[PDB]
From Swiss-Prot:
Coiled coil: none annotated. Made of a minimal module holding ketosynthase (KS), acyltransferase (AT), and C-terminal acyl carrier protein (C-ACP) domains, and additional N-terminal ACP (N-ACP) and C-terminal thioesterase-like domains. It comes from the Bacteria. This is Polyketide synthase Pks13. Involved in the biosynthesis of mycolic acids. Forms, with FadD32, the initiation module of the mycolic condensation system. Synthesizes, in coupled reaction with FadD32, the biosynthetic precursors of mycolic acids, alpha-alkyl beta-ketoacids, via the condensation of two long chain fatty acid derivatives, a very long meromycoloyl-AMP and a shorter 2-carboxyacyl-CoA. The acyl chain of the acyl-AMP produced by FadD32 is specifically transferred onto the N-terminal ACP domain of Pks13, and then transferred onto the KS domain. Identified as a drug target. Fatty acyl-AMP loading is inhibited by thiophene (TP) compounds, which kill Mycobacterium tuberculosis. Overexpression of wild-type Pks13 results in TP resistance, and overexpression of the F79S mutant confers high resistance. Structure-guided methods identified a highly potent and very safe lead compound, TAM16, a benzofuran class inhibitor that targets the thioesterase activity. The thioesterase-like domain is inhibited by coumestan derivatives that possess excellent anti-tuberculosis activity against both the drug-susceptible and drug-resistant Mtb strains. 4'-phosphopantetheine is transferred from CoA to specific serines of apo-Pks13 by PptT.
Length: 81
């Protein structure tokens, strides 16, 4: 199995935001994500909300299995902008 890098704007910003806040890259868009504390989840959510210009919550971040899933939420906002 091989890591899949981010494919579009939504995946790149989501992947990068996760890595920046936690200090560790998710590896790829399908990799299982490590568990976060609520502060890291809130920061990721705030940053994604600002960039996507739509509401992304700490719960959205916490319930995402991988970056692809979280980026899907971000993508819905980018295409509606
Ligand atoms: Zn890897
Ligand atoms: Zn998808």
């Amino acid at each position: 199995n091989v890591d899949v890098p981010p494919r579009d704007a939504a995946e790149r910003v989501t992947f990068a935001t996760w890595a920046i806040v936690t200090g560790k890259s998710p590896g790829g868009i399908f990799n299982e994500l490590p568990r976060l504390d609520d502060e890291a989840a809130a920061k990721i959510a705030q940053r994604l909300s600002e960039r996507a210009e739509g509401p992304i919550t700490a719960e959205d971040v916490l319930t995402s299995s991988n970056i692809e899933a979280l980026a899907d939420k971000v993508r819905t906002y980018l295409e509606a902008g």
